[PDB]
Design a protein around this ligand. Sequence first.
Ligand SMILES: O=C(O)CCCC(=O)N[C@H](Cc1ccccc1)P(=O)(O)OCC(=O)NCCc1ccccc1
Lengths: 197, 172
Amino acid sequence: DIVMTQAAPSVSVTPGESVSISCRSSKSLLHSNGNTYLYWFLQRPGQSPQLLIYRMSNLASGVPDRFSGSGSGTAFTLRISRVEAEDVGVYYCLQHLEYPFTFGAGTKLELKRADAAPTVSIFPPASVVCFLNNFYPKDINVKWKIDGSERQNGVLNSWTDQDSKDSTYSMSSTLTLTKRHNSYTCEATSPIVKSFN
Amino acid sequence: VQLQQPGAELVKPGASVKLSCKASGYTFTSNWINWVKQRPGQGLEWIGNIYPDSYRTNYNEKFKRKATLTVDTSSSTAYMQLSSLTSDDSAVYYCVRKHYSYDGVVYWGQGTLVTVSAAKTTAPSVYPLAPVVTLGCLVKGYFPEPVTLTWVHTFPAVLQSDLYTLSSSVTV
Ligand SMILES: O=C(O)CCCC(=O)N[C@H](Cc1ccccc1)P(=O)(O)OCC(=O)NCCc1ccccc1
């Protein structure tokens, strides 16, 4: 079994700058015919994988020359030139020199951007939902309060992956209740707050 | 170049399932058809392939007694049968085409999400979410995944007791 290792589960880079992603194989991928059987795929948020680089460093149709590949025989590197917001996703290497074909564990690319505050929207009913959109960084908290009382139970949150246009993150928070109170408020991490009656 | 695959398949544990991949927009017998597994939030795994021209097959040992690849050349359709499913079998399965000769020609289908459980189908129950600008939509109480939504930010489905709840927002 040829093992493929991508040691970094993720890597952070500032837009406009460059970054490289490593992949190592337990057996050389170079063949007698003089060709290296290594593939690099990118899987964007919510999409199926797609070819990026084949053989040494051949670029797939439509791939910006900003990408390029290199590497010895068991050591390979995928390098992206001037990282753009649209580059967010997980990069996978793959050998097809020997059966069974095998994938690297994948490396998530993350973008470092300017701090940003969330745009909050609250929506009444039998559940109350709140959106904390386009903020940065990813680590943000939400607080719920009913008639001033800070409710905790009955909340389920959900985050999106880094935005491909602006690199911000967004979150949704739902407060579910028994289909006898007046002030419903949603606030983040002066504070950013939204309520209704 | 097209590889159509059904959105999902709810399967009862112990039972088997047969997944389809309809090719179109290229010479079917000229490309190998590969199948790949991806568990929700995890990496990728090669299951096996088949070359429609000769009917030759290759199987990852791990799935030798689990999958069976067949191709119907008269319908440009490829198939993969998965036998006696367990919970571990719940994942998205992609058929992928790769030219027998040219190397830079690899193309991935949209994938089929297989859900292995005894539970029963349940359509959603969409909802409003109008400003007490940003409009919302609350798709609640469906099963299994996935659901489609178009008009933004459509958030990952959340599981609330054998039921998935999702929401999306629109900002004009
Ligand atoms: O050389 C051997 O003994 C066979 C090695 C496997 C093989 O035939 N690979 C072929 C290339 C090759 C040819 C000659 C020598 C080495 C490699 P191949 O890459 O065309 O294999 C056919 C195939 O179905 N490849 C799919 C690879 C792939 C898997 C998953 C997602 C995307 C792509």
